[PDB]
């Protein structure tokens, strides 16, 4: 009967712990028209983590967006200290204007 619907009730309900410690590296991420979004993870930690909350955080989708690093294509499997991350650095991101029908 011509029928449809959709939901996706989920904006990412979660949240995550960190140790006080000198002993991690930020990386801000660009994207926005101004705005900046920083990041602190591990130099033995996969990014997958670290992108994966920069998508919660704005509800975008890994997909839609893309990271790269020094102009390179990062994946979530690779790891800051393979590609040198240093302190203080910046990563490469592409927030796309894409709004939703449904609200979280």
């Given at each position: 009967g011509s029928s449809g619907s959709s939901g996706?009730?989920?904006?990412?309900p979660k949240e995550g712990v960190k140790t006080e410690n000198n002993d991690h590296i930020n990386l801000k991420v660009a994207g926005q028209d101004g705005s900046v979004v920083q990041f602190k993870i591990k130099r033995h930690t996969p990014l997958s983590k670290l992108m994966k909350a920069y998508c919660e955080r704005q509800g975008l989708s890994m997909r839609q967006i893309r990271f790269r690093f020094d102009g390179q294509p990062i994946n979530e499997t690779d790891t800051p200290a393979q590609l040198e991350m240093e302190d203080e650095d910046t990563i490469d991101v592409f927030q796309q204007q894409t709004s939703g029908p449904s609200s979280g």
């Amino acid at each position: 009967g011509s029928s449809g619907s959709s939901g996706m009730a989920d904006e990412k309900p979660k949240e995550g712990v960190k140790t006080e410690n000198n002993d991690h590296i930020n990386l801000k991420v660009a994207g926005q028209d101004g705005s900046v979004v920083q990041f602190k993870i591990k130099r033995h930690t996969p990014l997958s983590k670290l992108m994966k909350a920069y998508c919660e955080r704005q509800g975008l989708s890994m997909r839609q967006i893309r990271f790269r690093f020094d102009g390179q294509p990062i994946n979530e499997t690779d790891t800051p200290a393979q590609l040198e991350m240093e302190d203080e650095d910046t990563i490469d991101v592409f927030q796309q204007q894409t709004s939703g029908p449904s609200s979280g």
